[model samples]
Target: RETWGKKIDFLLSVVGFAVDLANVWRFPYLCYKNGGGAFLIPYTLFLIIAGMPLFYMELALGQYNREGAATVWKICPFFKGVGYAVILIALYVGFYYNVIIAWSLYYLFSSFTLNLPWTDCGHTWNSPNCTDPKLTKYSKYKFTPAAEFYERGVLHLHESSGIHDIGLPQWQLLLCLMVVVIVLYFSLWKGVKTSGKVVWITATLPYFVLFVLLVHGVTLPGASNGINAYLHIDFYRLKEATVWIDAATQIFFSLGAGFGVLIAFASYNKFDNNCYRDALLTSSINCITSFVSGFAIFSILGYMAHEHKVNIEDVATEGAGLVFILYPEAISTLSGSTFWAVVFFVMLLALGLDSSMGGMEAVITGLADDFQVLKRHRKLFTFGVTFSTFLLALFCITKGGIYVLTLLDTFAAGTSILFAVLMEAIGVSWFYGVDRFSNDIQQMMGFRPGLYWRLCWKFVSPAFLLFVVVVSIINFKPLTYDDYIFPPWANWVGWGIALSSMVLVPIYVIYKFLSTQGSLWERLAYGITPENEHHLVAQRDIRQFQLQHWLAI
Candidate 1:
């Protein structure tokens, strides 16, 4: 029920949540791989038609109802399961996502030495096959010091074979994970009153570090080459459906929609706040941040390509390999390697911390708002949520942790999140009625959304979501990590992880319908009716079933 300490706090938190590790780690690679600069067309198009609409919808829904994701569904109670679905999704993400931040923390600590550990081949963790990065030619049999440090020195991956043989948790990583959990607990235990202030650094520091890195990056010898490769517009590549699908999925994940965090954050806004403008401003900032981050990423990748006398494509990659192996390798070749390494990892920490904080906040706020007992004892509840995630996250700190991280990353939020958002779109625009929802926004913002937004909510956005969901299903492949293809059982477990959250929707629907005491038609009427409007249902004014409600757009 407490509002932000200041307007900037709310803005920074939302921006912080949206502009996360994906912006730096994923978007640049996706842009370059899909069609370089040409990929922006579909990305921008989807942003307008799908991403921003959902972003705006969640913000308005939370602010208007003054409730978190679960309780906010009072507007259409049958879809209340969606609140639980997203909350579960966010919780699943925390199980592996924070391990990434902990890795950054380990990198930050490792940067303190005069000679960077990953820079040379003579270290204890280095293998006989380790090749000096100074060697110009690529060797298929050889490994780079940076790669070894990541695989052996940091992850201790050499200790285990695969997910099936995952060994005990590494003590160092366990300590680092504890540090991350402790920081998150303290930041969130007091609710937004404390988190709002914490974002002052966690949200803004990454931008400051990025600006510094970009200035330094562009001045590097091969910076122009990297930048050119990044911005090279291959119009022909856009003709492929895969490119369009990649753009749509990237924009969806990059903007951090359908995770319940946006709604939870917006729930703290004052009633008259102009969330329409806030949605535009924050989402735009998130996209622009992703775009600008490409320059910083590719500039270093270019420098790495030049140094190794290899193609940019060889050094370029996505996910942890790009950040942990490639980027660190590139930084080690610089004049002040330690300082640059410190600066880089600090930025990663800031980026990951704020985003992780947002996810945890969604779970905390969503559950606390739904159950009064949890709200009454919020601090204990906050500790409970953070501690549970930390405990579950222990599986990810093992010798084969990267495999677990990859499996969870692929399944936990990929299609399941898309499906959750699709259900939300249908529930709100069709079941709850777009006209009434628009009125909710108008009451808060003093103006109804234009026809374009209405159309997007009712037709275009849901279609966009459905298209992506179908593409994801059609394109599914067996999980693999490097040369190790996961066995059938692992894939089964991954699917189970994905489906567990999705099943909540239909289960709750059946439960709601069967538990209601009425005739079949009457139960159906009460199902779609808003809780606050149940009086109309009792009086037989079943407006939702009328043709006008469906046709009103």
Candidate 2:
């Protein structure tokens, strides 16, 4: 009942939250596919304008509102509902996303096996060598970006019956999923006391080991093959609207910036918490971690390419297979197989738990804050959210998890982020009077957000967001079920989910705007606010609070 308290060190908390498993496996593939050599330029550019700008924008709004999403949008009391609208996006995404952590957990345990099913060396001259007749759905399947591991071999799933046909048992995988959700609930029910401490191990330690393995990997016989496959930059790729959209989406996903996580966390601040400095520090640290991870992962694949005599393009892959289906088997053939196995599994566990728990906590925080009926029973609410999410997750887990994950990764990962961030950008920039806000920021946060950041907020971020939303919608319901390589129809399903969040927020704002809303005076309840300790402005403190928040983000 102590509210889990604000025990988390902001930097450590942000680092653990930022560097997710996707950054390790998915990003490399995206970099290679979109622009073999030139991914980072647009990626980093989006990091600042697209991702980082909105990240600060949300933080600034929260710091100013002195409330989480539930009340943060109360400027127009009708729009006050938008905060919950955004929270719903996080909930929907987390419903499926945390299942990924469960898969990571299962994979971590699987690593203990002497022969990891993941190491499909693509040896059959072009068969992906993953499709041994006894183990796969087909006699000889070609490799796709999103492949899998089976009992006897891996699945290079260019096409087939997808996850349902895989040998992994449905009931067993279902039970394993149950266990995963239970653990997620366990970590969160204790609130930040347990979850906050959980990240110390589950969130952070893996990166160190990741670096160690990566360094050793690039030196292996086929390491350069991995590098070339992933690192060759194609400058022309940036010119494509979809490419910029992907870049922006990637930055948004990596930073955990605009999902309104900061606002919830900031709600727990200590009036003088100095969030301006915290946000900047967290932003820089997250980017550094992402950059470092790219180097570490590619290094190991580079070595594998050397050993196997394959070019890095042939050696590297995208999606789940890159780590689960590729690295485990790859390590098994190496000299220090045992150590690599241990480290790799541990890293998966660490990243999975860290990201999932952070996600689960977000839901818990939002629900408890939104519905005061459950405020006194925070643990109960935690259990409630976890269990509900678990049931929705079961949808993904059926067919041994492939059916749902295939659809989710393609649709949800980038899609949820694209729209969620877009709304926050608009809310803060136009609704919040962004230019005036930035002037206030120059004071406490040290560096004023430059013209580039400002321009992105005003124009580029929105245009990029609109493109992602439109293109993604056009392709929502996926004809084929692969992670990144969805059929065009499937894009709308992705677009629909993202649109739900972006759409709801603005409607709620309009409702508040049209309503005979209370004056700013009445809405504040004459200063007896809900977020209590976090009420930054007092009876006569509007200007000062505005300055504090503007700078804080």
Candidate 3:
């Protein structure tokens, strides 16, 4: 209680996680590619049934039990591994992602070049051709040399054969990647006292960039056209089965619901914190921001369409097109080009780093915190995790690695999140008891989780999770280490990543439970230790959360 801290506001911290890139970058493009405007309907409904409730479940589980998401899952003991794995996945994702922040660094430098890249039509990579009055806004999606061009039309990398190349140069990108690794290493290596300072930079600055982008992106030519195209709202994809699968899939990654990372983060909180309203407000604010970002993004996309003389449908590229493909090419023609380019890259950087580090810390801190192996050795733990992750990511930064990281990031990261979430739900519902769970929430927050929230957690939430698991399971094959595609050897690597983290979770738990055999007197009478010394023992206490803040919503 003494060491744990009070929140300045749950709204800020909860919303902090909610509005990161998943909603901003990943959601918009995903919506565009999957079903356009039609996507929002299922998307919205899913957010209601699938989205908010599970989100609430996560909040309740963490806040109710007052344990780190992983610590509380000790109910089944074996399930604790799920929590550990979520942190690992976040670790895996966090390192490379900070490259986005490094990128913003480069762009911020460019912003000072007196001509932002977005504003210029310049032939020079460093100079401004965009300011020339003679230059026109008709050059969208121009193929550059550095990026990989996939099909005749499809853009594979954001930097794909566009104004730059198939992708950013590996050497340069790698160097940038190193800078991020270094910053993240130091920031979190010291833990939250330091990380808390860094997050202020990582979190707040992103909004400024997005705000500028939204204001300026709308004014660009064909910006609204792109907006219209993005908002097309197609529900037909729902018929394909994969549509809903994709929706849940993305949500799994995007939404931080019931994630152990937050649990780990929140574990540092004082018992008086109220996560119920925090969850509710965070979800609502995130939905609103997603719409706001869509407007900014679509308008720029429309500008890209108007300038390039292509249909908005043509640029619906997700994996890479959203940034390198759409941004550099589209922003080139906007008025006051350089000013906006600075904002754009800065925005990406800010969001990427903030979200990236929070997840990364979970992986490093989660493991160390549990093993009791690194208690006083925080610095060593930082070096250990960061270096190892960098090496793993190095393989991802190689010769044919343009798409390698994305696939690995997506598949590994995606499966890891939902897998953990399901375990979290089951842990709370089956092991922890929904009635007590509701009581914790109601008592702490001053209001019960309504019938719907309870129903979803008991049945609907788990059922929908089961549905998603099935679809993902069906789609799963083996993926190669290099490119992460389905292949014989790749299957082994995929299995390794999946099995190493997942399969071992329960085995360790069972061993511990067996060793602890209950009553101390029996053990002592039997010539054993009197006390029941248990491994990974934990309890849920989310019910201690303070009420009346974010929950008032």
Candidate 4:
């Protein structure tokens, strides 16, 4: 079986996967918008509650079993659906994420020009209201040049009815999408050999770029005010339960805990690799990276607001807008706008690339492990997955593609992840037995997980996740992109995309239960017990451990 060349290879790959697009764009915005520096309170709380424990659990599962996530579910078939759901999530994310890279590439290529196209309002795509704040009399209201370019230039966005209104593919975006897919294929072609080596550059370089950018950012006019705004604490936001939920959700997603990407990455480790150490080291750095990125991002944003004499909140945005809109606007006014623009977008590309690599690996490894026949044809499998995914990705480059992409992001990517993590926690902790899992960890690492780990796995973590899921449902609203509200049918379709993976859990359980022979109780017992191939442990080995421990008890 192919494994990572060294434990560091596994560490870089998994840590790279975890510290991704969200750490760069999403977390900073959430940090600033919530309570600035004060948001760290709940964020840190949930990191302990939901993040670190799950990160440790997934890594340990794959390392001990030496199996990808789907195959690891052989430990308990009833929750095998959870594994498949994770793969499906990877599949959905893999399809759309590359388009984002393509978007960055499109911007990157354009950045080579003198004026930095988004910095000027001279383009045909610019709205009548669109004006560079620096060029005009500062208004409390103005459409940013960066925001206009993102909406009118890149997306070519139009009023939308639904998925049916997907317009013709934009030639520029399609060309860029093809290039991104090709680059991704070569990065993974030799399996982990190429990917492992590539991470030395792809994963590590972005942090240097981020620091350089932040240093440059804070030197600009009004930079400290943006940093000040970012650090400004809002005691009122702490009163809202949603702020706490947002913190937990950010921790869950940012750590890459629920996605099975970590499992796939760790599956390449040697049996006794100290994944417990990796978990603490990687997760801690990831959170710190997110916190640090806030400085890099909002320093420039504060400058942009101060230059225009507008409130910092006006220029601040989230998701794609934060990267493409706010950051670009900030860079446009700086000295060497083109140089900084190139630096910013390149960093964005590298960020997306690492995450994309993990998602692609998750789909490839999980499926290959599930089917023995495909395992031998590894290169063929990689090509098939990449090629088919590339073809499907063109769907996102169409004229109304942003709308469709927004739907997938809102439903497929945004929804169900918390729920999936919740199920993963329940499957391993409740079904596989947290005590048993700790025993395996001790076997690998020489000590049992401490009380904090045990408490989280069994109770606090799951309760918190359940709370977030329920609140997310209660707060759920139908999809919207900019001012375009999706039609009722489109909203229904969005829900279908979101719920599809989650619905698979019971579907697989029911199928297995009815198919197993004998009385109802007998079939259930069969369904619930770990499969024979569940682990590397031989029956004699487990029996010996069980006997020794049982007598001691």
Q: Backbone collision count in every prediction?
A: 0, 40, 45, 1
lDDT by residue (tens digit), candidate 3, 1-553: 1133234343465555565767766676676566466666666677778777777676555554445545555444546667766666666565355544554565455566664434334344422222322342222323331112221112123334321123434665467668777876876766665225434554566566567667778777667666766667555666655566656756655666534566655666655566667666766776677777667767766765565466665533555335544555445555666766766666676667667666765665556556667746878988887777776666444434435455555566655566667777776665556766777777766777777887787788788888777776776543322222344554455556655555545765555456655564332222211112222122211221224311322
Question: Given candidate 1, what's the lDDT at residue 67?
Answer: 87
Ranking by TM-score: 1, 4, 3, 2
Report the lDDT of model 1 for residue 527. 85
Q: Which ten residues in a row have the lowest lDDT in candidate 4?
A: 536-545
Among all windows of 10 consecutive residues in model 1, the one with the lowest summed lDDT is: 133-142
lDDT score for candidate 2 against the true structure: 0.58
TM-score for candidate 3, residues paired by index: 0.79
| Colliding residue pairs in candidate 1 | none
Better of 2 and 3 by TM-score: 3
Name the better of 1 and 2 by TM-score. Answer: 1
Order the candidates by lDDT, highest first — what do you get? 1, 4, 2, 3
TM-score on alpha carbons, each prediction: 0.93, 0.77, 0.79, 0.89
lDDT of 2 by residue, 429-521 (tens): 654555655765655354567676677776787777777777665643333432344434445565565566657755764554445346765
Which stretches in model 1 have alpha-carbon errors above 4 Å? Answer: 7-18, 29-39, 135-142, 194-197, 233-246, 333-335
Model with the higher lDDT, candidate 1 or 2: 1
In order, what lDDT does every prediction score?
0.79, 0.58, 0.57, 0.74
lDDT by residue for model 1 over 1-553, one digit each (tens)?
Answer: 8886664555446565556777776676666556367777788888888889988888888888888878888877789998899999999889987998898898888999998888888999998877775653342222667778888888898999989989999998999999999999888777776335445665677777668667768887887898887778777876656666667667766766777887887898788878777778767887788777777777887776676667776554343455676568657656788888888788788778887888888888889889989987878998899899999999999999888987887788777888899999999899988988998888888999999989999999999889888877786777766457899999889889989988889998899899988998778877888888888877889877799988988
Candidate 2 stretches with Cα past 4 Å from truth are 1-7, 10-14, 115-169, 194-196, 202-204, 229-231, 300-317, 333-336, 413-416, 435-460, 463-492, 509-553
